[PDB]
Amino acid sequence: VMEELEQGLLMQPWAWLQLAENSLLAKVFITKQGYALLVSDLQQVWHEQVDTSVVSQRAKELNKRLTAPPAAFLCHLDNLLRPLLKDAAHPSEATFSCDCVADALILRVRSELSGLPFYWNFHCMLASPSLVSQHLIRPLMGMSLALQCQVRELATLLHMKDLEIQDYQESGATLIRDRLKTEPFEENSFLEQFMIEKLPEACSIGDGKPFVMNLQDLYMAVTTQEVQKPRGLFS
Template structure:
C-alpha cells in the first residue's frame, strides 16, 4: 500500500471551500488518505474492520456487508479526491472541519434510498511533509538536473559537429537557421541567478514587515 500511495501524484482539490493537496489510495476493502496544505500533512489509514465499524456507527439504519459500504464509499469519495468531473463530485455533499491538529472530511450521499454518512478522520503526520512532499520533489529535481546536464553535453557535441561541417565547406541554405554556439557556463550562471532571485523573493514574502504591508 505504501508503494502504491507513494507512486500517486498529489492532486489539488477544493473541500468545503478550502484548497488542499490530496492523495487517496483505495484497495479492495481498505484505503489510505493524505491531505496537505503545504504546512501539514494529515493522514488516515483504514482497514476492512475499521470501515465496517465506522459505517455502522454513522449509519444506524443501514445494514450491509463491508464490501457494499466500501464500494459505495469509493464511488462517491474518489472523485472528491481526484478532481474528476463535476457530475461525479456533486453526487456527494462534502464538508471540512479542523479541530486542533485533526482534520475531518464529512461526506453525505445516498445508498439504497437512505442517507449515507462518512467521516475521514485524519490526524497530523509527524514526518509526512518530508516523506510525501519534500523527498519526491528532491528526487524529481535530481532527475531534471541530470537531464539538463545530458542536454548540455549533447548541445556541445552538436556544436562541435556543426563546426566540423563548416570547416569542411558546408554552408547553410537558409540563414534563419543559423544559431550561436551553446555556452554552458553562461547558461549555468543565468540559471543560478534566476534561482537566487526566486529564493530572495520567497524570503521577502515571509518577512513579518512585508506580510503586514500585504495585509494592510
C-alpha cells in the same frame, strides 16, 4: 493486511482536491479491508489508516439507515474518490468539506449514491515524522537529483550538436534560410540567464497544482525504486 495498505498508499500519485475555495493534495488507497489516506495543504500533513472494525461503526453512525457491509461501502467510497482524484473537471455529485478543531482534520465527503445519502468523515491526525519523510522529503530529493542528471545529459547532447554545427560551418556551406542561426550553447550563461529572468515564476509553488500537473511520473518512478616362440626357419 496493514502493510499492504501502506505499500499501496506509497505507490500512488498525488491528486488535487478543491473544497470550499481551498486546495488540498490528497493520496488515497482503498482496498476491500480498509483504506489509507494522506492529505496536505503545503503547511501540514495528516494521515489516516482505517480497518473494517472502525468502518462497521462509522458507516452506521454517519448513515443511520444504511445496511452495507464494509466491503460494499469501501467499494462505493473508491468509486466516489478515484474519478475525482484521477482527473479534474469531471462532473460529479460529490461534495467535499474541510474543518479543523484543535489539531485534527475532519474531511467530510457527501455524495448521492444513485439517489441516496452517502456521508463519510475522515478524521485525520498529524502524520508522524517517518511518514512525512518517506512520502515527501526523500522522493522530492530523488526527483531533483534525477532532473539535474537529465539537465546534464541535455547539455552534453547540445554540446554534441554544437560540434556538428561547427563541422557543418567549417565545410563551407550556407543556409537557404538565415533566420535559423543559433548562438553556441554555454551552460554558465544559460544558468545565469534563467536565474535572473525566469526563476521567480518557475519556482512559484502556488497551491500545489503545478506539482501535480508536471512532476508525477518521475515521483512515481522514484517511489517505486525506493520501495523496491619363433625360432629356426622363422628367426
